[PDB]
Amino acid sequence: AHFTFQPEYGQTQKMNLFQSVTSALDNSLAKDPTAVIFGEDVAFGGVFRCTVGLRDKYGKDRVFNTPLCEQGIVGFGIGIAVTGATAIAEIQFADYIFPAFDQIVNEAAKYRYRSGDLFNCGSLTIRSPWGCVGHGALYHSQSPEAFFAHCPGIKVVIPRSPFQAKGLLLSCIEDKNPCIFFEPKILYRAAAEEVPIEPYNIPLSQAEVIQEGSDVTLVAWGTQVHVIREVASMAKEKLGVSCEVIDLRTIIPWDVDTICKSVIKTGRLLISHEAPLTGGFASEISSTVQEECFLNLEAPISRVCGYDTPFPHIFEPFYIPDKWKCYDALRKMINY
Amino acid sequence: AHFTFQPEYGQTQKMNLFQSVTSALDNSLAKDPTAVIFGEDVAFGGVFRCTVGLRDKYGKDRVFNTPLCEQGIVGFGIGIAVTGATAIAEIQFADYIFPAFDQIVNEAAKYRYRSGDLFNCGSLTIRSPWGCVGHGALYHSQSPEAFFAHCPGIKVVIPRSPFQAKGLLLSCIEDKNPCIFFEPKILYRAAAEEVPIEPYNIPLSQAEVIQEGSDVTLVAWGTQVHVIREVASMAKEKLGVSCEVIDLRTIIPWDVDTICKSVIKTGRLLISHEAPLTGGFASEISSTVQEECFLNLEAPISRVCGYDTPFPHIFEPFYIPDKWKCYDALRKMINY
Amino acid sequence: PQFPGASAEFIDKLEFIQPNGIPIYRVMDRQGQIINPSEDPHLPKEKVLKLYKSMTLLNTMDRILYESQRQGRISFYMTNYGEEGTHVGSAAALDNTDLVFGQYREAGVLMYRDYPLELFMAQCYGNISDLGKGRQMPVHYGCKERHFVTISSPLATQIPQAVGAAYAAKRANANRVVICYFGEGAASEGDAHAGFNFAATLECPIIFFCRNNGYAISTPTSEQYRGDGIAARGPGYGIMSIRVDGNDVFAVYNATKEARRRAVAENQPFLIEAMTYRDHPISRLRHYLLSQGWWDEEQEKAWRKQSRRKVMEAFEQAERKPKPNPNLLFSDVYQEMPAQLRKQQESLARHLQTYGEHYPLDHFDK
Amino acid sequence: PQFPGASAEFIDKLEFIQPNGIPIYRVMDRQGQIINPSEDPHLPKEKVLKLYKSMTLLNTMDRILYESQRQGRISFYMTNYGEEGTHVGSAAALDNTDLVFGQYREAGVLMYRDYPLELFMAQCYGNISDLGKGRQMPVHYGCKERHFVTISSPLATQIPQAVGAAYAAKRANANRVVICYFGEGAASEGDAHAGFNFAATLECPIIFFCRNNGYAISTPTSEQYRGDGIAARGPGYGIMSIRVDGNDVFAVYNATKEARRRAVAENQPFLIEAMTYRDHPISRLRHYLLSQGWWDEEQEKAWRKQSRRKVMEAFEQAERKPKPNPNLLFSDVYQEMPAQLRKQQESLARHLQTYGEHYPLDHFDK
Ligand SMILES: Cc1ncc(C[n+]2csc(CCOP(=O)(O)OP(=O)(O)O)c2C)c(N)n1
Numbered sequence A, B: 001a002h003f004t005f006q007p008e009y010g011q012t013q014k015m016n017l018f019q020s021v022t023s024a025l026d027n028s029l030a031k032d033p034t035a036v037i038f039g040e041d042v043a044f045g046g047v048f049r050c051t052v053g054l055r056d057k058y059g060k061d062r063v064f065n066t067p068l069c070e071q072g073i074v075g076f077g078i079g080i081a082v083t084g085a086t087a088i089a090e091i092q093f094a095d096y097i098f099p100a101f102d103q104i105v106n107e108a109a110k111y112r113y114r115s116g117d118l119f120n121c122g123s124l125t126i127r128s129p130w131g132c133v134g135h136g137a138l139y140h141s142q143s144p145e146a147f148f149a150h151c152p153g154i155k156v157v158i159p160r161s162p163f164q165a166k167g168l169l170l171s172c173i174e175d176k177n178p179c180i181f182f183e184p185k186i187l188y189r190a191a192a193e194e195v196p197i198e199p200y201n202i203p204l205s206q207a208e209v210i211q212e213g214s215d216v217t218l219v220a221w222g223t224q225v226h227v228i229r230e231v232a233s234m235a236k237e238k239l240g241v242s243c244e245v246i247d248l249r250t251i252i253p254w255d256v257d258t259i260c261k262s263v264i265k266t267g268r269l270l271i272s273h274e275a276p277l278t279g280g281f282a283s284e285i286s287s288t289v290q291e292e293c294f295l296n297l298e299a300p301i302s303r304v305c306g307y308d309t310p311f312p313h314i315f316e317p318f319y320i321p322d323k324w325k326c327y328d329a330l331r332k333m334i335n336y
Numbered sequence C, D: 001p002q003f004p005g006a007s008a009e010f011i012d013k014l015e016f017i018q019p020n021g022i023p024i025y026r027v028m029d030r031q032g033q034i035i036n037p038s039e040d041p042h043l044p045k046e047k048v049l050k051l052y053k054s055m056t057l058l059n060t061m062d063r064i065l066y067e068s069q070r071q072g073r074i075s076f077y078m079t080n081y082g083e084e085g086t087h088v089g090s091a092a093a094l095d096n097t098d099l100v101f102g103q104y105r106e107a108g109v110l111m112y113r114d115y116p117l118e119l120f121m122a123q124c125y126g127n128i129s130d131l132g133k134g135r136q137m138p139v140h141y142g143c144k145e146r147h148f149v150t151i152s153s154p155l156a157t158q159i160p161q162a163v164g165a166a167y168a169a170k171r172a173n174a175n176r177v178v179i180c181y182f183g184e185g186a187a188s189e190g191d192a193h194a195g196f197n198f199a200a201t202l203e204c205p206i207i208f209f210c211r212n213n214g215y216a217i218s219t220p221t222s223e224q225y226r227g228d229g230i231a232a233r234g235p236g237y238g239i240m241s242i243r244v245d246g247n248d249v250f251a252v253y254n255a256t257k258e259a260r261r262r263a264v265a266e267n268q269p270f271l272i273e274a275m276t277y278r279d280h281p282i283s284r285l286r287h288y289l290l291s292q293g294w295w296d297e298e299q300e301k302a303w304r305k306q307s308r309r310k311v312m313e314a315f316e317q318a319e320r321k322p323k324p325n326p327n328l329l330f331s332d333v334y335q336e337m338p339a340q341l342r343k344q345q346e347s348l349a350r351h352l353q354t355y356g357e358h359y360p361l362d363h364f365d366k
């Protein structure tokens, strides 16, 4: 495996990432009588088990399957939300969210603005499995967040663990704006930690400094957070370099202040993501940090990302921005 | 109007931008027996007149209307291209290209790569009206290039004039990769200049320095090129500043070398585009220039873009990155 | 058989099923005469006069706003010519709270629901009275009070949305139906297939109202579909369907009234395809009014005068109102305003303080 | 009437059209007996034995590759169980050069077209012999030589593409047809509506072959559609349609042969919906072979042995081949390789020179 996962709100219970999603969904339907969950094959529990037991507990009219049509799933979800009911739509793989791009970008994102707030679909949340998985190749490995980042009106949120996933998903479900929640599928079973059984919220548009450092700032999201956490360890051990590790968590609207504050202190920044380099979200963070921290930047900001190719099957080990690729970039930046 | 348009290959004739597109299409069908043009209402000449007279000249089986379905238009175009025939699909407004996003991103862009080059849709070109028009509001004003810029496998090309449009469109039609050609609709009638009657090509992935300068580099594409050209004039007149003006022309794969070479010389860069700031293509250019020209940058790179909102109807004058907004940003950057 | 896909028997000979003409339901002829007494809805005089006045007032507004667009006073306009009967007739069959989704030819629904002339015009002019805050192009109407969901330009996107609102209505169990209007061209979009199928499989109380006028801009229906119109698609989705005469307000009313009754009772979708064109709905109803002794030449002249006057008063008022504060360009993108968006708003205020003379500030509020 | 949308007369009474059961065409019964002599295709013994051997060899390969996936030797696999007859039967009715578009259950088409066991396995293993260069997930087959367009994961995307290839075939005028396979679940996607409508309005020589097995993963067809299957949708699009017994290779062959003949002659689409499940196609054909005196127990044993042996030889070979050079991760993104992509390729080569010990280089070519 290319990463290693490493682990106040009341009673907790050990939960892997798919169990924490189920817990968030369960808490939601229990406290919101209007809430419904729908998509492709969610009735029997889902292909990643995220909705197991929910239909039996809440009823077939609240947890149900739709015909196989992603544009339909999103348009249908928008319509439910327009009436004020909570709609939690599932897109089976993030790679299949594209048929719904028009409904997301031209409709959901613009619903409130274009009606002067007479109508909205703020109670809509779209959840979808995301990121590489070792052998998913072109259509079971994608990280589409940068496509959505250029669309004013929606929020895009990506957790790095079970505890983070339940708190962030509950916040998305309750947020008054259409949200896309991307679940790193490689972590569904791999990552397990203590998760509060009752509902709790983690704020959107707030990054989390998970490790203080003074020489360089490292930023990532999803599974890649664990990769840069390891890279921080390698830099300390091999270079005597103190790394500040930051989980962005919300892609848009993103936490510009936390990132700039960190870079003003360290003077160096490395951003990493599985998605291709060109047009990737690291470009937005880099351009922005350069604009706000020009005087503090000691070296050029580095972006360690996937290559500008479709996501390959047999070549995955060579494609991903692994710890060695991140470490080498960091070494060179330190040496600048 | 927010801009002012200002104007070897044999005989030329004055042509506005829609006439130059028609000329490119005419030259194409004349020299390529396999070529066909299809879309919504292209038979009678199109809503912007770009296909007038072509059906009468080449036949109803070569210039024809399709049902009203953008996903269908692109999938259909891909299929034609798979057999090796030239397919020139029209999407009525760039704002309506989204229903076809999945066919463009998951299919056309990946066709060659995923089949190991056993199949391809390189003879496909999608042309579509683009950019603001004074009152098009949310769905007749969009500039979607940044969404496409994050997709390896396609080329995205935007001309700034009639001469540039015919040469670049002929290059897209003949290029061996699926191309999206965005036609600035505000220029269809507004811009008119001498255009060769016979076919000629302008290279893709090559920016054009239209004015040499030594103090700052200005980069834009489409109609915005004329805005920065005017801004260069204002800077010279009011500030004694020498501006280098560059038309990017190809969004992806973009001409990194021409841009960096210019910035290494001037030490300052301002990028401008009608599209919203966040996730916009200026972020990619800025992050890249910072990585390649860190030692030469005298001031932070500025991005003067549309705001992070949907494109408004009555507020358009206040939304666009006009000459005064660009000029003020340039003034501040010079003063840095 | 024993197959989990479709109930059927075997056949021992190879036979391809051919596209097996749906008749057009009509109640009154071109002379305004009721063709079959058992189909007369016998609507009360007051209601029928409201149908007539709503249709003609819409026509009067169309004439003035169309001319306005030609003079460049408003940037765009779409008339309702030929669609007055389909919309006022169907709207009259709905309960006032039934939710409506549509596209560009539905102003008659709002007119029947007593939407103010002042608001139709505020939206077209993008002035301070527009609750839409001048953000969308003209004729993109919306009214929360009258349950008319704001129109958007992308064709057919409202179809699966209308199905989701209907599903939620079903769950709320409050005897409401959703109606969704669209053209035969829009029926070609993938979103139309999604909406029809979802409505059937999820059992939603929704009426799909398709206006078929033979053209989608320059495209004739021969280039749009090859089956027998849109009505012929209903059965294949398992949807009860009917075709009606769009120039006959009574036929439209009857079909919508019955579709509404059954959709709400059975939680099942209905498809109504109304045939219209480019024997005009206004002309046909006027003949009916005359035959009942409910209208005469003097009443026609007085109404034409009172309507022209009402429309021009709203028109003059709309044109003199200022446009909204430019700050409104930044709100409602999200419910709250992100700090980075506020930063952009502040950036504009600073810009206008210095370069304001170069902007049309005198036209905007504040 | 006089309406430009649909030819029809008027009706004077309000009647909603109800979803009006398409029978399943069968040629031979579960005991392998020809039910109706006039429907016997009387295919030659050699051809019928090829149908039988192609189906059983596919089944043998499926068994071994399925086990391989379970042991984690290949990362994914989709079997062809229950679909052997629909694919070998329809493929036998096509001309060798007819272009095929499909999804995940079409390996039998390639098997009938003599695609090498070595290539099926090279793709699943992503080894150096894969012309796909190991880029896609297993069972995403493609063969330019055998006119089988490379499979992609997004459902239904190949449907409108197949229509465009058919339109181009029509223009090239070379008597070719395109066939496009998909499942009843995939028929719910908007791309399916697009393809069916475009094929009808643009008059394309294409056969849509829908496999209906009652389930799309965990979803029963009751949650997928409410009309009478997919065949019932054909007429509404103006497409000639038929439903056939997917466990009967002869019924499948007859329907495909006639659809191909008429599609190519008339430039019109045909829809075949084959009913299958989870009376197996192999079992039924074997009964037929026995009745003709064309197969016996000893031949069955010898074939089962020769096929197991052929499959294992290809299997062992596939597993020992190395994977492709990692440089192949960068080519074919565009036809040519952009300088910035080459820069990334060079970046990887430099990285591996220094950190190579941390990568599985011993497994990859060069
Ligand atoms: C997705 C999309 N594609 C194209 C257009 C441009 N457009 C606006 S109206 C129109 C014709 C609509 O035809 P129809 O649905 O039949 O309605 P009608 O105007 O005849 O009432 C087209 C192609 C659009 N608004 N949205």
Ligand SMILES: Cc1ncc(C[n+]2csc(CCOP(=O)(O)OP(=O)(O)O)c2C)c(N)n1
Binding pocket: A040, A068, A070, A092, A096, D105, D153, D154, D155, D182, D183, D184, D185, D186, D187, D211, D213, D215, D216, D217
């Ligand atoms: C656009 C898209 N959505 C969802 C999926 C995931 N998926 C793969 S197979 C499948 C079921 C397909 O059902 P069907 O078309 O009936 O074929 P069957 O597998 O029964 O032969 C689904 C939902 C996908 N590959 N692409």
Ligand SMILES: [K+]
Binding pocket: A122, A123, A124, A125, A172, A173, A174, A175, A176, A177, A178, A179
């Ligand atoms: K939400």
Ligand SMILES: [K+]
Binding pocket: B122, B123, B124, B125, B172, B173, B174, B175, B176, B177, B178, B179
């Ligand atoms: K091309």
Ligand SMILES: [K+]
Binding pocket: C102, C103, C151, C152, C153, C154, C155, C156, C157, C158
């Ligand atoms: K719409």
Ligand SMILES: [K+]
Binding pocket: D102, D103, D151, D152, D153, D154, D155, D156, D157, D158
């Ligand atoms: K596919």
Ligand SMILES: [Mg+2]
Binding pocket: C183, C184, C185, C211, C212, C213, C214, C215, C216, C217
């Ligand atoms: Mg129409």
Ligand SMILES: [Mg+2]
Binding pocket: D183, D184, D185, D211, D212, D213, D214, D215, D216, D217
């Ligand atoms: Mg199925």
